[PDB]
Symmetry: D2
Subunit: 317 residues, 4 copies
Amino acid sequence: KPQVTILATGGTIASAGAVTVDKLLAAVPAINDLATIKGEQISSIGSQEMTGKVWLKLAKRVNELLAQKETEAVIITHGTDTMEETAFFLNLTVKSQKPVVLVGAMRPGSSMSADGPMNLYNAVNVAINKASTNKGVVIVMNDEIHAAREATKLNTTAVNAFASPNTGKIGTVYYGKVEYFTQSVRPHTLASEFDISKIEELPRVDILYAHPDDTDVLVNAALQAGAKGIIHAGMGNGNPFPLTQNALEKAAKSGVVVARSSRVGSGSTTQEAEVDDKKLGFVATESLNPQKARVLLMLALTKTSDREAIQKIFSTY
Amino acid sequence: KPQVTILATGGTIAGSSAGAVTVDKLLAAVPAINDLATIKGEQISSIGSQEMTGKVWLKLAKRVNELLAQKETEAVIITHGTDTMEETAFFLNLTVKSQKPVVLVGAMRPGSSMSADGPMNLYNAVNVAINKASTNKGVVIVMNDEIHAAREATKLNTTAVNAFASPNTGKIGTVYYGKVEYFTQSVRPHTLASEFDISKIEELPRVDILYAHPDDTDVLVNAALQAGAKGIIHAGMGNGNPFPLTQNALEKAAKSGVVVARSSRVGSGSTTQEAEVDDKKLGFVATESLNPQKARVLLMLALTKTSDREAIQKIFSTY
Amino acid sequence: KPQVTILATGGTIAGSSAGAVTVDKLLAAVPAINDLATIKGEQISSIGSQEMTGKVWLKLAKRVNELLAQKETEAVIITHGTDTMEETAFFLNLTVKSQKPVVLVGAMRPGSSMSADGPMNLYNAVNVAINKASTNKGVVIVMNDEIHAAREATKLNTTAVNAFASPNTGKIGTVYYGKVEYFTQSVRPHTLASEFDISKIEELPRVDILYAHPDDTDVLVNAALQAGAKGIIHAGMGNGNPFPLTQNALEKAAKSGVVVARSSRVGSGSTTQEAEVDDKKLGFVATESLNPQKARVLLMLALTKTSDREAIQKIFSTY
Amino acid sequence: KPQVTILATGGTIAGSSAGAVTVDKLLAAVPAINDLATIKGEQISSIGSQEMTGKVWLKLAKRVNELLAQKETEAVIITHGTDTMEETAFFLNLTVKSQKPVVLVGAMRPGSSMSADGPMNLYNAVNVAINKASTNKGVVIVMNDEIHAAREATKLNTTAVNAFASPNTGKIGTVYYGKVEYFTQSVRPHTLASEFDISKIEELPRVDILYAHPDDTDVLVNAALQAGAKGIIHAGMGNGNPFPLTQNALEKAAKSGVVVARSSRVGSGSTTQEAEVDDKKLGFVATESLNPQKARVLLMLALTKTSDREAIQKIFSTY
Ligand SMILES: N[C@@H](CCC(=O)O)C(=O)O
Ligand SMILES: N[C@@H](CCC(=O)O)C(=O)O
Ligand SMILES: N[C@@H](CCC(=O)O)C(=O)O
Ligand SMILES: N[C@@H](CCC(=O)O)C(=O)O
């Protein structure tokens, strides 16, 4: 039988070594037939309380576990609100081709038609499947396998809230039957240049929400609070309001890296559209979203704040 | 022939006296529209929509109200940048005191480009403007052969000609080479049915939007407050959930008489009452089924006549 | 408390005397619905929805008409297999002579499955049935926290719990843990406004559906004619286009007096008039904004009182 | 410069000696493409794609194989009607023996139309064809700034310029004013990795497609057998489910040696094995994650070298 470790970052979504994982095995007994399961409790929080502190603890533990010859994969149970950020962080920091699968539930385990039992069962099948190797970190939700780079929560409440709006799911898992149709051609995991092994605190990056009649005071507060980066979630193709642009140009010149994303929800924030990124000293985040752009920029800042090197990071990953 | 005014907020959305050089160039570009209606033209502003302000919204709304109050004028078409068309559309949808059609239209590609989308978008927008079924549909955005309710429309994509969507409801109808069909209509009050009146307003109240993430801060809430925010939209994580440090700052905002409304960063779905956030104890409003940029517009209008949490919840549970 | 009848067409969609053992088993598995309504139950048929027939359709619409004409009855819920729920819903949408709510609900996973969707679907569906705002919304499908107008609804996916969609218009409403909110209503006539009356109809006119592709054939048109087709829905390539050989057979079918209606295989959008097919000259109808299976239901009802091409086109341009 | 041959299967998709007047017109309508590549032209056929036949598919795939085997030729672009582009694209995906880019492109609006999509579509296709990362992506469809895998691609709308989608996976990349980006690639074997070889084929096996509904028939299955069908695609209700009368006729079809492949009318998702239909007992094949019309293309290619149910199941579970 494959050996798999479930890492819990909160409560149950439905002795292994963590009571929470013990309860998962009670709630979804069919998973004990598929893999030998060990449990750890990494954190015990809603995903909306997540911190760089917990990300770095999680990423270092996943790297430890996947260096062990007996461990074939890791599953992480995680609140849905920020699963896309943790997943994306791990996609660039996990130095392995062994599967890492992130799974949660849009309804609590006690609700009518709770989604968490099917999700967990499907997650374990994805984690043990031979094809899941070198697919990078994935989110498994609602019978779908989404690449960490592309995946996002699109909906506030729906069981089908996870989507890959720029590329679509790479695979399906239906009552445990795992099929891949595509794979990411952007480098992840073992091919990643990032290494957080001796990082104990991630660079501060704020995200600003653009609109008509915008301000500079939020740009200015981010600077005063020690922002090493700012993601601008711009209007349409990453366009800022003029007062804000002026503040962001000053930000960039003081050596705080400014990366242009968009508020819209999908598509690329492109270079050489209406914003002279080279002249203003900005980075175009291209086909990401503000919250994943933030993760990539934090990782960039562990080893450079050069506009050109960071543009190349956003155009590569 | 039906009498229609085209109000330009910016450059030409097609090509490259009706009373404005921008509209004379639209008519030269898409001569078919001259056969559909007697077009008059005015330049309201001279800006890309990323430069839009409350000042321009107020000028634009008052002018639309004056034009539709004229017996002879049957509709207004507004040519607008795509980036913030959804905000302008939602603003007029709650301030325009008339059932006559108001149609916003723009171009995802410049007029000069290969396969410019502006000519079809404008030609279609004219047909929607003059169609009898467009009466009391509220303000609409006509883009890519689709008619979207102002309440529900958003730019969902950075570059695509199909970048406009109604994620919570779908388009209310279609317009294909001029042929106009409606399949649905909004049951949320708009236009004539709206309680809001900006005829006597010269400056709209300040409302900030904050983007939520893990490891969030209180220093943008405190900066919003210090710049005299009357309202704050919180673009929360998932179902409008804040980071703990941030909720603490917003609680202090809400007690100090600044209205905090919870929306979401995700893209779609309702930011609901009676979920993980205790709005009644913390002093917050839930925006429910809008998005942070349109929730900003509704809170600005709410703040023109009340800062009361209960009244403002009722506004967001109505419009 | 509201009085609602659940009509079961098959087995239980939830779990593993109201009047029908199937509905008693629903009430046992989902006891929270019993504080919402006084439930009566009847068994109309005992089949998977892939075994549905015109005979069951007529039995169902007649019984719903009787039930909703009772002063004691506020609404009807029909538990239905998912495969053909859209056809039954659309039939009832044009045959039910009431504004009282009619809700179709099913389950994409069986009741005995992990994370069964039936219990929530059914709970949500009762809340929609008893909601005041559901009056005169027409027959609706309630699946995966969504209210879909019968005209617009389709199963779009083989297996997903979110398989139901309204691809031309979107959901008319949400239901979330029983909280019902409508955002739109269909502007196409339904239920009490429909010209159709099946009360005296014991068998529906025969309508066949054909799947278009390159290197297509005339033999299936010919077999449909040979079996006594009164109408044929052509699921065309792109905007309802036939292969030349097929179009020649359809021309003959139409001249013999069999009604030929052009639909499309693609999934969404209008099969339009005045496109590449000369419908007038060849004697064809364009089905416009439907899909082949719903076009079939509307043609079947159209044939209960005309086979006139111009009359039927008006029917497809109306409903 | 790179050398690219444009193959025309119909009229100009843009405007209103490379070696073909159609391609000469394309180059004059979009002179931008002369800077990007040395373009040669051929007229393979002159038809609307709704008139495509296996004879044209074989002529086209054989000429693509000749052109890409030349050391001077870097890529092939094929202008094609949108209606059946997914079928031809898919056929070439399994029959082209090269890793060199093959790109299909068309237009949802005629070249003479306001906001014609053809010029940009063609310009973007030439950029995808000459891009280094286009190597070994399989045959692609370039439409509306998107690069779709031939395996995954379909026309989803009758009219919209954004009609092309990959509902099971999404686009594998973007092309925006010529700038090419891939984000994924198919992990299903294609082009040079495919086991199919049509170099010694003259006529593709006959495969029909049947459209499933309530009160379904056996007279179309029976007509398909009488016309010498070697394969039948069944476009089933939900997860590929037949009406009983039709199932009994398909079981007889299968026992006769006619390969029955189960697909779905719904639009997306897998028609799975070991759901409600005993495939192994009934003697049927599950087409899994395709659609009726691409499953037809795979079954026609399967039928060039086996009619064994087990071997064809493996082909559908592989390609
Ligand atoms: N919103 C909470 C609730 C649990 C969930 O939806 O996963 C979280 O993200 O942890
Ligand atoms: N960013 C410009 C571009 C024009 C457009 O896409 O509408 C604007 O919104 O005004
Ligand atoms: N395909 C069956 C199974 C149950 C269901 O999915 O509704 C039916 O439509 O009845
Ligand atoms: N139905 C025609 C129209 C052209 C097009 O839209 O591609 C064809 O497919 O050839």
